[PDB]
């Protein structure tokens, strides 16, 4: 499995983990 | 930072949680 | 942001959320 | 199942957690 999170995939991961508030 | 940790290397849920608002 | 998780992206999300044990 | 919930639709962390070993 490719476990790297780059660009839009990192942003999706952050929205997933954090919720709508998102992140900094 | 986060791109080095998660994109260049592989990061965990707990690491991502460090960057949440 | 594309928030859909399909195929390998779903499998990565599961390894992320669950850890190595993974999932069923 | 999980593909309907997460791929066809959009799913949350909590939903993914339901499928963890």
From Swiss-Prot, chains B, D:
- The domain of life is Eukaryota
Which Cys pairs does UniProt list as disulfide-bonded? Answer: 6-11
The entry's protein name is Insulin A chain
Instruction: Give the originating organism.
Output: Homo sapiens
Q: Which gene is annotated as encoding this protein in its UniProt record?
A: INS
Span of the full-length protein shown?
90 to 110 of 110
């Amino acid at each position: 499995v490719n476990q790297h999170l780059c660009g839009s995939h990192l942003v999706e991961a952050l929205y997933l983990v954090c919720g709508e508030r998102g992140f900094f | 930072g986060i791109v080095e940790q998660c994109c260049t290397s592989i990061c965990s849920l707990y690491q991502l949680e460090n960057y949440c608002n």
